[PDB]
Amino acid sequence: MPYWNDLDGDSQVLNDTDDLVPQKINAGQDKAVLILRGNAWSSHDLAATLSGSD
Amino acid sequence: AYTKISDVIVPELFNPYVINTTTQLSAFFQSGIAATDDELNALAKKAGGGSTLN
C-alpha cells in the first residue's frame, strides 16, 4: 500500500524583476506478511476403555 | 500426484492511496502575537501603500 508524504519547503521573497519556481511531491511504500500455522494430535482408545474415561 | 502450488499462478493486490502528514506539530499560538489594531489596518489595505508609517 502506498502513501503521499506532505509538501514542504522554504518560501521565496516575492519581488519584481524575478519569478518563482514550482516544487514537487513523492510517493511511498508499505508491506506486510501473511502467515499460517496449525497442528494435530491423536488420542488412544483401548486405554480409554480401560482407564475410566476418554 | 499433486497440483502442487508451484504450478498455479499467485496474483497480487493493491488498495488506493492514503495521505500521510509528516508533523512537527507547531503552534506557539495563542500568544503574542494576536488581536490586531486598526492602525496597522491603515498600514495594510490600499490606499496609501507602504512602507510603514511613523
Side-chain angles (χ1 to χ4, degrees):
Chain A
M1 71 197 90
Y3 62 85
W4 280 354
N5 59 346
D6 186 356
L7 54 83
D8 58 348
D10 298 347
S11 302
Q12 295 89 353
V13 178
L14 173 57
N15 184 24
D16 62 345
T17 68
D18 186 2
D19 193 355
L20 303 176
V21 172
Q23 294 178 339
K24 66 173 67 180
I25 303 101
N26 291 336
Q29 189 65 270
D30 181 6
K31 300 299 283 186
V33 186
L34 183 147
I35 59 99
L36 44 82
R37 302 291 179 82
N39 70 344
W41 52 78
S42 79
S43 180
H44 310 297
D45 189 8
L46 182 141
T49 187
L50 182 65
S51 59
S53 62
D54 286 348
Chain B
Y2 287 153
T3 62
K4 185 69 65 66
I5 184 172
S6 178
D7 290 350
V8 63
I9 291 173
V10 285
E12 292 175 348
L13 288 175
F14 291 164
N15 58 344
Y17 290 151
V18 170
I19 305 99
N20 179 25
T21 304
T22 297
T23 59
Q24 71 280 6
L25 176 59
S26 180
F28 191 79
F29 293 173
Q30 72 291 0
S31 163
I33 323 301
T36 313
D37 77 354
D38 292 344
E39 184 66 24
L40 272 58
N41 286 337
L43 287 164
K45 298 176 180 297
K46 58 182 177 181
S51 67
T52 300
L53 61 79
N54 42 344

